[PDB]
Amino acid sequence: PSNNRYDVTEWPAGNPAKDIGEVINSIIADIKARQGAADVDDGGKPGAVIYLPPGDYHLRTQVLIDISFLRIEGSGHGFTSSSIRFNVPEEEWPDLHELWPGGSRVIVDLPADSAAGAAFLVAREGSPRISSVEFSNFCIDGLHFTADGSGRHPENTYANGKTGIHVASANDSFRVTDMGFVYLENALTIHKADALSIHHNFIAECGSCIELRGWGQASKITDNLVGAGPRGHSIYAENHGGLLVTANNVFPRGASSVHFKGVTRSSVTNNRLHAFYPGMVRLEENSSENLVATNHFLRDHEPWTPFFGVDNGLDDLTGLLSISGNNNSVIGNHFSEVVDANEIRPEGATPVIIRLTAGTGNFVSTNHVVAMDVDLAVTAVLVDPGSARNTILDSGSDTQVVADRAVNAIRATPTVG
Amino acid sequence: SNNRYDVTEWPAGNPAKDIGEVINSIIADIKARQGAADVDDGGKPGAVIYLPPGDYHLRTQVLIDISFLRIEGSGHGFTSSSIRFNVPEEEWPDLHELWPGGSRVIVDLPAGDSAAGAAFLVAREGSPRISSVEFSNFCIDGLHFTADGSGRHPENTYANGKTGIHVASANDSFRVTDMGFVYLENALTIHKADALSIHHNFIAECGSCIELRGWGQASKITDNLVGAGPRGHSIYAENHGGLLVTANNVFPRGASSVHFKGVTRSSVTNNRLHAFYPGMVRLEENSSENLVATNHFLRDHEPWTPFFGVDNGLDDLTGLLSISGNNNSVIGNHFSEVVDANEIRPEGATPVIIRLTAGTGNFVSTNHVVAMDVDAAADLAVTAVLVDPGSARNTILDSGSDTQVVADRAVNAIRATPTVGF
Amino acid sequence: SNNRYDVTEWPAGNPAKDIGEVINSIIADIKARQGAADVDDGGKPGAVIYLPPGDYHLRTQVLIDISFLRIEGSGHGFTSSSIRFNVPEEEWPDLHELWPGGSRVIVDLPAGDSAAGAAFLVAREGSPRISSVEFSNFCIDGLHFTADGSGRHPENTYANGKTGIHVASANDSFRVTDMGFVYLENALTIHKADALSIHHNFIAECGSCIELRGWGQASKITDNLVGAGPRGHSIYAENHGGLLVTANNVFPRGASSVHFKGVTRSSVTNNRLHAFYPGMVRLEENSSENLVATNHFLRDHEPWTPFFGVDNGLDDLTGLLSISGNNNSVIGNHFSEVVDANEIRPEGATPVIIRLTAGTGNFVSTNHVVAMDVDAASSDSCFEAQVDALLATEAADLAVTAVLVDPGSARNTILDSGSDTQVVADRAVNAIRATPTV
Ligand SMILES: OC[C@H]1O[C@@](CO)(OC[C@@]2(O[C@H]3O[C@H](CO)[C@@H](O)[C@H](O)[C@H]3O)O[C@H](CO)[C@@H](O)[C@@H]2O)[C@@H](O)[C@@H]1O
């Protein structure tokens, strides 16, 4: 209509229960037909808002977003643990108060070019960059995980070829806020982001949660609750500059909590990070001039039977924080390492907390390491020979810092005696 | 029908007189329509209930026992009823307004059995955990405080037996966002919470503001404006693991700013904390392996006459930060201690900033203490860190001079902040 | 009636042509209906005014003088008008779009006091303080910048005398959330603010972005994306106590990222700050007992041709962080100083990172300074130039002064924030520990 406000349950001839994808695409075509002129009375393409009331909507056609200033909004993030439910014996399901996620719920009924499996694809090349698209307070549900030859129960594989939101083109000032994502192989994949905000979402039981790909700048990932799968990323970024990752509560069971490849001049600060495996925070492939500060790291063991034996393939020598790059700053972090001598790998090894594998000029200061066998000896800081000219202060006793003293500046944490 | 309701458009009841009845009636309708749990891969998606801006009396407790219910308004609606109730009554007619507003739920319940005085009770037993209930951008107002047997003027007691939102049952993925709470004995009490987010609320002039009880995991309390009363909690958690408390601006006048009982592996980081009393951040009953980092602490004196002599009963030896527990990390905090030296209790005591009362392996590093003597500004001698004999094997670095760090050097690792000069 | 209004469903006027008249008409309706302050424990609950997505010209200033008014939209609607106005004009017809969108308020007011040029003016005297006004998820667009005799092209001056939101009176519990501001000389100016939250906004290509004026207490500026102009402020506060500034991503090209005058007992913590000039964080005029912690600072050279020679007037001896006041705490920050040695001013100077110009008892600990001699050249293409320079870590070392303590400042403590040669300070009167070196 003329005021650019649409409701998927009030779309003529549309059935969002059967195919909300088709309904939303039809609405987008309606907006474009009405907003053809870019420069009439200092305006002309203001965009629109599409509302999803709470409900169960099947999406059978991918939505293509190629207009700036489109807002898609609902009235509920709608999360429930499909992982827990699919591991309750089927005979006990009738007594459960509910089974499925809810809220403003988009069920992704697409086949498994991973962009083709995305419920929402945002794509538009040329100039200017597509700008200020907003996704807010709805639920995207991939419904089931499926057999992938890995031997585990189908619903525990984290594999289905489905993506919640995939942004393929260079973008500016995008927002993803208050969402729920559940049971998607990839929740949110955003290429070439500038000044993006991913804020206050619930992104859990997805193979990978947040991936920022290609390159980007001046973006932020804040105040999210995030839990991924053992082959996937919780928070991943590549070739980003000026990224701020803060105030997230990241829980298991991603391969990692935060994974950077070629990320520079960024900050991973004040997050609560919980993993069941090593390699929680990975700065790789010349990830340089980053601040990693005041994070709470907990690494312990998977308590839940269905995922006992499942891990990310990495041993305890990896480090909880691993750095390959120059001139980083690792300051004021807390590391709690809770492992059984029996489950340490390789057998007889001493776990590593912070590992510098390559690069120069890294400043590691004022980090507290707490290790328990449920104390347990750990290496607080391991500087490999291929990393040098680092500065390591008050981040472990002399024994806990493994490093060439001739080419690294080391001040051991004073000991009790 | 499309699961969206407006409390002013529901044909049963009157939200001005009893919005409780209206919302309960709406919830009954949702349940009547959403009876089947597995139809076409769904069946119980929940609903949204909208409160337009307005004054709504609640006389019946709302019982929320369904997942995916959102209750939303269009205004947090805060104004200081504390200030207004202390303005002389003859001046009230000249004030532009008296009461809070926005999408306002007036809690007209009798006092509690704490949960019986709750405007919103979230309770459901069995399985699975009730999940993804959302409260957004409305106002809950307990209207008046009343006599508590002692003592001061009724409107300054912080007592009425009323709760804004009480969550009794184990819950997952709940959200409380953009709310206003005012004049409630308890604003928000959530038991047995997993992956909860309490985000960007205004929770003030309530006896206690945020209480996380029983136990919980992986939750967060972020970006809130919080002010409590002198016998209550600003932020309280018990038996939580993996709690993140960050970016809050906590102002007076709670008994404390953050109080943990048996909280482990959690983070109280990057908050601004202002109190009028000692005992601002309390880690108690084996609160262990927590990070307390880069907070700004200010302790000064109550300036406002109606509360001038009212306090939390704790003396200046208590500490602004008190820790009873193991293996915590206290890093990069600023402490401003602003007191009248003549009013320090006990008489002749040197005030304490960080106190370790019990536990081992606490790491305290790179904290700045600034202390001043001001009448209710000269530099004031303080004990930056006090380690009691019952706490040992701690590491204290660059958090005070040798005189400022009171601790047994034989069983703790102490590095005094370097002195000026050569 | 139910206190909910939609600007496109109002009987009088035309929000396309003058939304200000429409909104003022709505406010008069609210007041007419809400005249009594104490009827059944209520009576003035306020209202909500909704702006669907659309282009709305504002020709009459909106005056908000009631508590509990919410003005909300359905899109922050930002696009870079700066990029567009530096694309050759003959190419504009071929661009997918030109203007900002979302729920868009176009400020068509003449230049102001500056309050007269505000699209929204919040003002009320008497008691109590106006309270709990909310602005949410709409766009305020000042359309054009104009010539001001500064040499620059008119659209690059950052001058138009327009303000998005101006709050003139003492206020309590205000919120500004999810907004988009673009092409305004001043985005958001709030006087005398108590318990204010400015949260999750996009405030960019404005001369100044956030200014907290007069005085204030217990406020917070959190989770914003902010970019100002070379004569203006990104985040500014004066005579505030207990301000929390955190989780902001501040990018160029403000004169500064954070500027305090007489601000005390406040926290500037966990922000990402990127500037093209010195003087990124300024604590001035007895700014005391503040925590400046775990921020990521980047200072480098403007790479975009339209602004390549434009700057904030300050030289490299200024400092990235400058402090005039007592008893502050500077802990755990990262500083990247990424400049061309030939472009340092004055010629042959050693750049200063942290400068203590006056005051006593400042505690500076555990700060990492990384300094590189790089030549970022420039390019006509904005986002290309911007991303390439952020990712370019290929360089030789650059000598810097990590901490400079002027003679006017003393009794400070400087720990692990630089080697001895990097800390220029009187050792007799300050406590200095050099970062260990090899
Ligand atoms: O490990 C987190 C990972 O597992 C999922 C289910 O696949 O959540 C499980 C869950 O329970 C674990 O945590 C609680 C600790 O409170 C413990 O009692 C239980 O034994 C664990 O399995 O994890 C969260 C808390 O992190 C709980 O709410 C949930 O029941 C999945 O959602 C998540 O990605």
Ligand SMILES: OC[C@H]1O[C@@](CO)(OC[C@@]2(O[C@H]3O[C@H](CO)[C@@H](O)[C@H](O)[C@H]3O)O[C@H](CO)[C@@H](O)[C@@H]2O)[C@@H](O)[C@@H]1O
């Ligand atoms: O002290 C906080 C506590 O008191 C209440 C009223 O019960 O608010 C009072 C208030 O005023 C104090 O701070 C102002 C501004 O610095 C000062 O001028 C006044 O003398 C003080 O009493 O506190 C907030 C700021 O913390 C002000 O907005 C407010 O007027 C209550 O709301 C709060 O929980």
